[PDB]
Amino acid sequence: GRMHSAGKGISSSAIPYSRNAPAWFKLSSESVIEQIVKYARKGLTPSQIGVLLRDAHGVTQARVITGNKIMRILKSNGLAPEIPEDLYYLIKKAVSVRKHLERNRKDKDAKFRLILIESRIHRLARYYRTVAVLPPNWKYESATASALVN
Amino acid sequence: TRSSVLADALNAINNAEKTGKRQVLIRPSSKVIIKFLQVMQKHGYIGEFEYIDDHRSGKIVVQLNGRLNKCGVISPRFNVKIGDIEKWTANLLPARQFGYVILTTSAGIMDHEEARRKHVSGKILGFVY
Amino acid sequence: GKGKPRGLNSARKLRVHRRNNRWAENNYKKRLLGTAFKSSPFGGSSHAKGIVLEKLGIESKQPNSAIRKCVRVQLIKNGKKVTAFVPNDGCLNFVDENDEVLLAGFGRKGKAKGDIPGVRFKVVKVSGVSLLALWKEKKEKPRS
Amino acid sequence: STELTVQSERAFQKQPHIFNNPKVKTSKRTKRWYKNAGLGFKTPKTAIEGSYIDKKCPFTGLVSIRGKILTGTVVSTKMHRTIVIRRAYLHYIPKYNRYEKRHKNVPVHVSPAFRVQVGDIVTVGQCRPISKTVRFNVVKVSAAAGXXXXXXXXX
Amino acid sequence: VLVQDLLHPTAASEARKHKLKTLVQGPRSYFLDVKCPGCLNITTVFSHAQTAVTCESCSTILCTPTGGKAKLSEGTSFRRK
Amino acid sequence: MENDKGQLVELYVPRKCSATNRIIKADDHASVQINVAKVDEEGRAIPGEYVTYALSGYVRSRGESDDSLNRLAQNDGLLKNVWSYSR
RNA sequence: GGAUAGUGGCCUACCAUGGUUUCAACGGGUAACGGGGAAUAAGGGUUCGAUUCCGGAGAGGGAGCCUGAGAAACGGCUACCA
RNA sequence: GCGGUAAUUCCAGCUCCAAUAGCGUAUAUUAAAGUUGUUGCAGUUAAAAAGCUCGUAGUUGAACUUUGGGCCCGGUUGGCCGGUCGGAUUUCCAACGGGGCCUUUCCUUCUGGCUAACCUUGAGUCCUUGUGGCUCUUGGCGAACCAGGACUUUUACUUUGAAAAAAUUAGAGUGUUCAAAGCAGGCGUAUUGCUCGAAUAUAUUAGCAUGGAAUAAUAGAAUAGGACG
RNA sequence: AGGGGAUCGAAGAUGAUCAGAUACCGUCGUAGUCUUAACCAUAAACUAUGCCGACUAGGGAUCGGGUGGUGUUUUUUUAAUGACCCACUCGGCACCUUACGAGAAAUCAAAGUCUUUGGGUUCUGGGGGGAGUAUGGUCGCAAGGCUGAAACUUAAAGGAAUUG
Ligand SMILES: [Mg+2]
Ligand SMILES: [Mg+2]
Ligand SMILES: [Mg+2]
Ligand SMILES: [Mg+2]
Ligand SMILES: [Mg+2]
Ligand SMILES: [Mg+2]
Ligand SMILES: [Mg+2]
Ligand SMILES: [Mg+2]
Ligand SMILES: [Mg+2]
Ligand SMILES: [Mg+2]
Ligand SMILES: [Mg+2]
Ligand SMILES: [Mg+2]
Ligand SMILES: [Mg+2]
Ligand SMILES: [Mg+2]
Ligand SMILES: [Mg+2]
Ligand SMILES: [Mg+2]
Ligand SMILES: [Mg+2]
Ligand SMILES: [Mg+2]
Ligand SMILES: [Mg+2]
Ligand SMILES: [Mg+2]
Ligand SMILES: [Mg+2]
Ligand SMILES: [Mg+2]
Ligand SMILES: [Mg+2]
Ligand SMILES: [Mg+2]
Ligand SMILES: [Mg+2]
Ligand SMILES: [Mg+2]
Ligand SMILES: [Mg+2]
Ligand SMILES: [Mg+2]
Ligand SMILES: [Mg+2]
Ligand SMILES: [Mg+2]
Ligand SMILES: [Mg+2]
Ligand SMILES: [Mg+2]
Ligand SMILES: [Mg+2]
Ligand SMILES: [Mg+2]
Ligand SMILES: [Mg+2]
Ligand SMILES: [Mg+2]
Ligand SMILES: [Zn+2]
C-alpha cells in the first residue's frame, strides 16, 4: 500500500455499522439534497460539500440520509463537472509543479515529483477512460493541461 | 495486495495451532473460505467457527482443537483430470488412510474421497491433515 | 515465494526462463554449440586413426617424476596434430615413426589423464594389430 | 465495405443468370436473388434490401458456407470488403502443466450486408478459397459497437 | 492467551484499541449541539470541524480546527448526541 | 490402530497433553503430570485419589503452563473466579 | 479475364494500400525428413528416432517434356553444368 | 594416489575375488542430479538482488448476486436373515450415490405432432382386519423430442462418449519339451469330424458430441438511446 | 567551454631516510578542489539482505501525530497558553531479552510460519582459472559504460566454526 511513497501508515475513516439512522437526525431528504445542490452551485467539490455538511450541518453520511452518493446527486442535477474531481486536483497540482520547474531548472526533486504525479494522472486517466466517463481519445498534455484547469 | 483470501485464512489457522492456541481471528472470509472450514469441521480437524458480520467482507472466529497437523492451499488452482487426483493425494498426503485433498468441482467444493464417490472433477483448492 | 512466477498462465515465462538458464549447463552448452564437431581432434567420434610424426618423452607432472613415452599423430581424416600415449611397459618400442596408429579417448571427456600434461588420447592400435596383443605376444606386428 | 456507386467498375456488376426483362415494365428495376446459409444465421435484411453485388457474399453470392464455424474479435477493417480477426486461446504446456496466451489472425471476407467496426465480436464460417488467404466469411455480428455514443460530450 | 474469547472481549481493552482494530470497526468521533447565549438557537457541530464553523446568523465563530477535535470557542456549552 | 480382525496391535498408545491435545512422547522429559488430590469433609486430603492433568513440555516452555492450569482446574471446579475467558 | 481437371495473386490488366510482429514477426543455425515409436524404470522428466509400418522427397545437379487414366517419370526422352 | 632398495599399486610366480561364453576399453546418452528445481534448488557472508525511483508489454489481482427448508422416485454395494436345490430376491436396517419436485424460482420461444406420467376414477378388488397391488377408458401434466417459424452475451475448467491402423507397450488365453517367441491349438468315432479362439486395456494436445454450474473471467440500465404489452 | 583559484593538494622538483626508496616523513607546487552551461553514469552506490500482502513473542527507550486528566510546575485573580508527568493508540530510526522456530555456522522477528516442500511478482547464480578477456553491437568528446563468448587448462577453489 501507498504506491509512490514507501509510506505505509493506515489512515482511513471507520464507517459506522448503522447503515441508516441517526434516528436523532431530523430534517429530510429534501433538506440535505437542497443543501448539496446549493453548495454545488457555490462551486464546491462533492468532498467540500460532504465536509461542510458533516461539521456545521448534522449530516454524518450524506449517502445514508439520501441513498445517493454526493457526486451522483450533482450529476443528476446537471452539476456534473467535465472531469472527475480527483483527476482535476492531480492535474492542477501537476501544472503548478511544472510552473515551479520552469522557473527553477536547477531543481531535480521537482522533475521527480512531476514525473510521479503525471504518471498517477495517466494511470487514473486510463481507468476513467475505460469506464465510459472519458472519451477513448482523452489524453493529458502539458501545453493543454495548463488551460484545462485554469 | 491481498491475493488468495483462502491462503491468509489457512496460514493463520496453522500458525495458531502451531503456537498452541485454540481460537483464530481470520480476515476477511469468503464463500470459499467458509466451504473450506465447513469441510474441515465436517471431518473434525476444527470445531466451530462464527462469521462475524462487519458491513465489509467479514471476519471468522474459528474454534480449533489440536488434532490438526497442517491444512493448506495449492496456490495455482490446478486442473485435475479425475485420475491425477490419485497423484495429488499421493504427493501431499502423509498416507493412504486419512487426510483429504479438497478441491473445486462442478458438483461443488469437496474432499477428494467425496469427489471420488460422486465422480466429478475440476480444480484443486487444497488439503487437510 | 522467491522469484519463479507461480501463476497459472506464466507457462511461457517458465519454459523460456528454463532454456535461458540451461545455457549455463555445460553439456547442454557443448551439445548445442557443436563443440564436439567443431573443436576436438576427433570428429566427435569414439576413436580416430592417424599417423605417427615424432616419438616423445613427456616430463611427468608433480609430485610425480618420470618420462611418459608418447607419439605425435596426425589425424588421417583431419590433419589435426595430436600428442597421444602408449600405455604399459615397452609398447613405445612397438611404434617407430611414420607408423599408422589408432587413437582413443582417455576417459575424462577431454581433460588429461594423470601426471601427463596435455595428453588427451592414448594409442589403441598400430599397423592394425593392437598394443595388448603385441605386448602379450599374442600377435606379431605386420611386415612393412 | 463498398458503400455507394454500385456500378463503379470497368465491368458491369450484376447477379448471374438473373435476367430482368426490359420488355416488361417492372416496378423494382433490378430483379434480385438470395438465400439463407443454413445452421440458423438469419440472412439479414440488409442483404435483401441492398443494391450491392459481391459474388462473395454468403447470402447474395455464389459461395456456400460449410466446414468450421468460428468466432473471433475483429481487429482490422482497412481492407475493402475484407477484415482480419484475432482469435485467441490458451495453450497447454505439459511440463509446467499450465497455459500461455496465444492467438492467430484469420483474414475473412465480409459482405456489405454487415457493417462492422473494430472491437465487434464476429461469427464467421468456412467457405471455399476466396482469396490467397481468405478461407472464411462473415455470418453474424454478436456485438454492435461497445458504447461509442455512450461516450458523448457533457451535460 | 492460548485460550481466550475472540468473540466477546471486554469493552475495556476494546476501549483503548484503534478504531479499525475493534471487533467491528466504527468511528470514535461524535456530534454536539453548541450554544453561545448571544442568540437563541443552538447548532449541530462535528467533533472534528476542519471547517471553522460559524453561527446561524451572527458572524461570531464557534470552533477552530486543529489536528484532532475542534477547540470550541470561548464561552460555549454543548451536548453529545 | 487395531487391524484386520479386532486385535489391537501396535504397542504404546501414548499420553496426550489435555492442554493442546497434542501427543506427549517419550523424550518429552520436559512434560508434566499434575496430581491434585480429592479433599473431603473439613480438610482431609484423601491419599490415593487424584484428579490429574497433563502438561506438554511445549506449553511449560512457552510459559503458558500457569494460565492454562488456572483455566483447566477452574472449569473442573477447584477454582472460583481468578481466570477470565476474556480480556 | 486468362489459365487449370478445378478454387485461388496461379498469372494478366486496371484499382486500392494494405498483410505479419515482444502472444517473438523477419533473419540465422540444424552434425533436421515428419509421425507410429526407442532408451532411461518413484513420479514429474530427460535424451533419441537415418533405419522393417504410415506419409513425404529424390534418382550426379538443375530445367524442360513426350506417352498416358495416372509421371514434370529418370532402370523415359531433350538441353545445359559436371 | 603408488614407485627414490625390506613396493598391501609397477614387472611376474603363487594364491584369492567379480562377472562367466562371454568380459575389457573409447565415445555418446539416461538414472545417481533437489547440479536446471512445475513437482523441487540456490542468492548476508560460499556462485547470485540492477545505485535508485517511474513505467509499457507480461504475469497477477479483496469481499458480495438461489441459500435454506419439505416431499417424491428408483438404483449398488454391505449387513441380519435364505426361500433354495455355490447363487437367488423380498421385507428390517443403516451407508453411499443418480433423478424429479414445492417453496415469489425460464425451461429460449410460440404454432401441433406424442403423449410417459397422475391432481385423475371408472368399476372394484388378487389378498395379511388395508392406500401393501396392476390390468383398467370418458372431464384433467408437458416438455420426452419431433419440425416449422421466431431469437440466442462471450469463455476457461471438468465429465462421459463418439471418431479413431496395425507392429510396438501393459495385458488375458494357450505347456513353442523351457524360454525369447508364435497365434496358435484342443477334443474323438484318430474310417471320411467335434470345437474354444485370434481378447481387454492406453490412445493425452486439438477438433466434434454430452452431463455438470463450484472456482476464474466475460457482456448488461446512468444525458435512460433501458425492461416487458 | 567561462568564472574562480584562500585551503588542502594526483603530477612534477626536491630534503632526508634505505642496502636500494621512482614511496612512507618534510618542502615547493601544476591539474584539481568551489561555481555556471554541457557530458560522463561508475563505488564495499552496503542492510554485502527485491517489492506488495498475511500470520507467528516479550521488553523498556526514543521521533511524529492523536486521544484520554478534579497529573506537576508557569501567577495575576483562576484561568488560557507553553513546557513537563503518566496511560493509550497509529506510524518512524534502533536497541534489549528470549527463542516455539531457522541455518553450515557466525547469527536471524526474518535470514521464521520448507520433504507437513504452492499468497502475488521482478531479477540473478549452476565448480575453479581462462576473463569481464576476445568478438560484434551500441552509447561517449575522451577516459570508458552496457551487452558479452569460446578454445584451453584444472581437483579443488570456497564459507563458517574449532584446535593449534
Ligand atoms: Mg496496509
Ligand atoms: Mg508501484
Ligand atoms: Mg491520513
Ligand atoms: Mg554467465
Ligand atoms: Mg613438437
Ligand atoms: Mg484496400
Ligand atoms: Mg484457378
Ligand atoms: Mg493487409
Ligand atoms: Mg539433413
Ligand atoms: Mg529428429
Ligand atoms: Mg524416420
Ligand atoms: Mg543423415
Ligand atoms: Mg537402410
Ligand atoms: Mg520422383
Ligand atoms: Mg550417386
Ligand atoms: Mg527426372
Ligand atoms: Mg538404375
Ligand atoms: Mg523408377
Ligand atoms: Mg565450368
Ligand atoms: Mg614386493
Ligand atoms: Mg601383482
Ligand atoms: Mg504440479
Ligand atoms: Mg517429491
Ligand atoms: Mg545447488
Ligand atoms: Mg558472494
Ligand atoms: Mg532496465
Ligand atoms: Mg475474486
Ligand atoms: Mg438431490
Ligand atoms: Mg613524487
Ligand atoms: Mg613517481
Ligand atoms: Mg556494479
Ligand atoms: Mg515488539
Ligand atoms: Mg493533552
Ligand atoms: Mg522463535
Ligand atoms: Mg517440525
Ligand atoms: Mg594433486
Ligand atoms: Zn451564535
Q: CB of F71 within 8 Å of any CB in chain E?
A: yes
The three-state secondary structure class of B11 is helix
* CA pair distance A146, A113, nearest whole angstrom: 17
Given F62, F68, F86, which is nearest E8 (Cβ)? Answer: F86
Question: Can you say whether the dihedral through the CA atoms of A4, A5, A6, A12 is positive or negative?
Answer: negative
CA of F42 to C1' of H226 (A): 86
Rounded (5°) CA angle A52-A57-A62? 75
One-letter amino acid for residue B49 of the chain: F
B128 — phi, psi (to 5°)?
-140, 125
CA of A28 to C1' of H105 (A): 38
| CA A101 to centroid of chain Cα atoms | 25
CA of A118 to C1' of I2 (A): 37
Is the separation of the CB atoms in B63 and B23 below 8 Å? yes
CA of A53 to C1' of H34 (A): 65
The three-state secondary structure class of B60 is strand
Is the separation of the CB atoms in B129 and B93 below 8 Å? yes
* CA pair distance A102, A95, nearest whole angstrom: 11
Kindly list the distances between the CA atom of residue C131 and the CA atoms of B129, C60, C144, in Å, as whole numbers in the listed order: 67, 22, 17
- Type and span of the H or E element at B125: strand B122-128
Instruction: Convert B91-115 into a string of H (helix), E (strand) and C (coil).
Output: HHCCCCCCCEEEEEECCEEEEHHHH
Cα dihedral: A83, A88, A90, A95 (round 10): 120
Cα dihedral: A44, A49, A55, A60 (round 10): -170
| CA E60 to centroid of chain Cα atoms | 21
Kindly list the distances between the CA atom of residue A5 and the CA atoms of A2, A117, E19, in Å, as whole numbers in the listed order: 6, 12, 24
Show Cβ contacts of residue A75 under 8 Å, excluding neighbours closer than 6 positions. Answer: D155
- Where does C39-144 have alpha helices with state H? 92-95, 131-135
* CA pair distance C21, C24, nearest whole angstrom: 6
- Where does chain A have alpha helices with state H? 29-41, 46-52, 62-65, 70-75, 85-103, 108-130, 142-149
* CA pair distance B61, B24, nearest whole angstrom: 6
Given F21, F59, F64, which is nearest B67 (Cβ)? Answer: F21
What's the grid cell of residue D54? 459481391
Rounded (5°) CA angle F64-F68-F70? 125
Is the separation of the CB atoms in D124 and D85 below 8 Å? yes
Is the separation of the CB atoms in B61 and B52 below 8 Å? yes
* CA pair distance C52, C95, nearest whole angstrom: 8
| CA D3 to centroid of chain Cα atoms | 14
Measure in Å the smallest separation between the Cα of A18 and chain E Cα atoms: 9
Which chain A positions have a beta carbon within 8 Å of B54's beta carbon? Answer: 17
State the burial class of residue D58 (Cβ atoms within 10 Å of its Cβ: 0-12, 13-18, 19+): buried
Neighbouring CB atoms inside 10 A of A97's CB total 20
From the list A91, A78, A77, A74, the residue with the least C-alpha distance to A128 is A91
Neighbouring CB atoms inside 10 A of A126's CB total 12
Write down which residues 99-138 in C have CB closer than 7 A to strand H.
104-109, 114-115
CA of A106 to C1' of I2 (A): 19
Residue nearest to nucleotide H47 (CA to C1'): C24
Report chain F's terminal Cα–Cα distance, integer Å.
41
Is the separation of the CB atoms in F30 and F65 below 8 Å? no
Is the separation of the CB atoms in A123 and A140 below 8 Å? no
Length of chain B: 129
Chain E and chain F touch, per 3+ beta carbon pairs within 8 A: yes
| CA F20 to centroid of chain Cα atoms | 10
Q: Are strands D136-140 and D98-109 parallel, antiparallel or unpaired?
A: parallel
Nearest CA in chain D to A137: D151
Query: What 8-state DSSP symbol labels residue A37?
Result: H
Question: What CATH number is given for F1-87 in this structure?
Answer: 3.30.1230.20
What's the grid cell of residue A62? 450524506
Show Cβ contacts of residue A9 under 8 Å, excluding neighbours closer than 6 positions. Answer: A2
Instruction: Convert D96-116 into a string of H (helix), E (strand) and C (coil).
Output: CCEEEEEEEEEEEECCCCCCC
What's the grid cell of residue C76? 588421417
Is the separation of the CB atoms in B49 and B39 below 8 Å? no
Other chains touching B, judged by 3 or more CB pairs under 8 Å: A, C, E, F
Cis-peptide into F47, omega within 30 deg:
no
Q: CB of E24 within 8 Å of any CB in chain A?
A: yes
What's the grid cell of residue A10? 493506515
What are the residue ranges spanned by the domains of chain B?
1-68, 69-129
Given D147, D150, D154, which is nearest A82 (Cβ)? Answer: D154
Instruction: Convert chain C into a string of H (helix), E (strand) and C (coil).
Output: CCCCCCCCCCHHHHHHHHHHHHCCCHHHHHHHHCHHHHCCCCCCCCEEEEEEEEEECCECCCCCCCECCEEEEEECCCCCEEEEECCCCCCHHHHCCCCCCEEEECCCCCCCCCCCCCCCEEEEECCCCCHHHHHCCCCCCCCC
* Chain A, chain D: beta-carbon pairs less than 8 Å apart: 10
What's the grid cell of residue C61? 607432472
Is the separation of the CB atoms in D143 and D132 below 8 Å? no
Q: Point out the nucleotide closest to D9 (alpha carbon to C1′).
A: G15
For chain D, list residues whose CB is within 8 angstroms of any CB belonging to chain A. Answer: 147, 150-151, 154-155
Q: Which residues of F61-75 are buried (b: 16+ CB within 10 A; e: fewer)?
A: eeebbebbbebbbee
Which chain F positions have a beta carbon within 8 Å of B65's beta carbon? Answer: 21
Is the separation of the CB atoms in D83 and D108 below 8 Å? yes
Show Cβ contacts of residue D85 under 8 Å, excluding neighbours closer than 6 positions. Answer: D72, D73, D74, D75, D76, D105, D106, D108, D122, D124
Given E3, E9, E13, which is nearest F71 (Cβ)? Answer: E3
Q: How many domains does chain C have?
A: 1
Length of chain D: 155
β-partners of residue D121 are D73
Neighbouring CB atoms inside 10 A of D15's CB total 17
Query: What 8-state DSSP symbol labels residue D150?
Result: G
Residue A129, CB, less than 7 Å from strand H?
Answer: no
β-partners of residue F53 are F34
State the burial class of residue A134 (Cβ atoms within 10 Å of its Cβ: 0-12, 13-18, 19+): buried
* Chain C, chain D: beta-carbon pairs less than 8 Å apart: 25
Query: What 8-state DSSP symbol labels residue D12?
Result: P
Residue E25, CB, less than 7 Å from strand I?
Answer: no
Q: CB of C7 within 8 Å of any CB in chain B?
A: yes
Contact E6 B61 (CB under 8 A): yes
Nearest CA in chain C to B75: C6
The three-state secondary structure class of B1 is coil
The three-state secondary structure class of C71 is strand
- Type and span of the H or E element at F58: helix F57-62
Nucleotides of H under 7 A from a protein CB: 1-4, 10-11, 25-30, 35-39, 41-43, 49, 53-56, 58-65, 96-98, 150-160, 205-206, 211-216, 220, 222-225
Is the separation of the CB atoms in D13 and D34 below 8 Å? no
Name the structure determination technique.
X-ray
Residue F61, CB, less than 7 Å from strand I?
Answer: yes
Write down which residues 35-94 in C have CB closer than 7 A to strand H.
36, 44-47, 60, 64-66, 88-89
* CA pair distance D124, D106, nearest whole angstrom: 10
Residues around ion ligand 1, judged by CB within 5 A, are: A 1
Cα dihedral: C61, C67, C69, C73 (round 10): 50
Length of chain C: 144
From the list D9, D11, D55, D48, the residue with the least C-alpha distance to D31 is D48
What's the grid cell of residue D117? 467496426
State the burial class of residue B70 (Cβ atoms within 10 Å of its Cβ: 0-12, 13-18, 19+): middle
Show Cβ contacts of residue D76 under 8 Å, excluding neighbours closer than 6 positions. Answer: D83, D84, D85, D105, D118
D139 — phi, psi (to 5°)?
-125, -30
Is the separation of the CB atoms in A87 and A124 below 8 Å? yes
Contact B23 E23 (CB under 8 A): no
Is the separation of the CB atoms in B101 and B61 below 8 Å? no
* CA pair distance A147, D129, nearest whole angstrom: 56
* CA pair distance F73, F54, nearest whole angstrom: 12
Name the residue range of residue E54's domain.
1-81
* CA pair distance B18, B68, nearest whole angstrom: 9
Residue D90, CB, less than 7 Å from strand H?
Answer: yes
Q: CB of D101 within 8 Å of any CB in chain C?
A: yes
From the list D118, D123, D119, D120, the residue with the least C-alpha distance to D108 is D123
* CA pair distance E74, E62, nearest whole angstrom: 8
* CA pair distance E41, E34, nearest whole angstrom: 9
The residues close to strand G, meaning Cβ under 7 A, are: B 87; C 12, 28, 31, 34, 37-38, 43-44; D 10, 76, 78-80, 84, 88, 94-95, 97, 100-105, 107, 128-133
What's the grid cell of residue D20? 430482368
* CA pair distance C8, D2, nearest whole angstrom: 45
Angle between helices A85-103 and A142-149 (to 10 degrees): 120
Distance A73 CA to ligand 15 centre (A): 90
Name the residue range of residue C45's domain.
1-144
Q: Point out the nucleotide closest to A115 (alpha carbon to C1′).
A: H54
Is the separation of the CB atoms in D75 and D103 below 8 Å? no
* CA pair distance D119, D71, nearest whole angstrom: 13
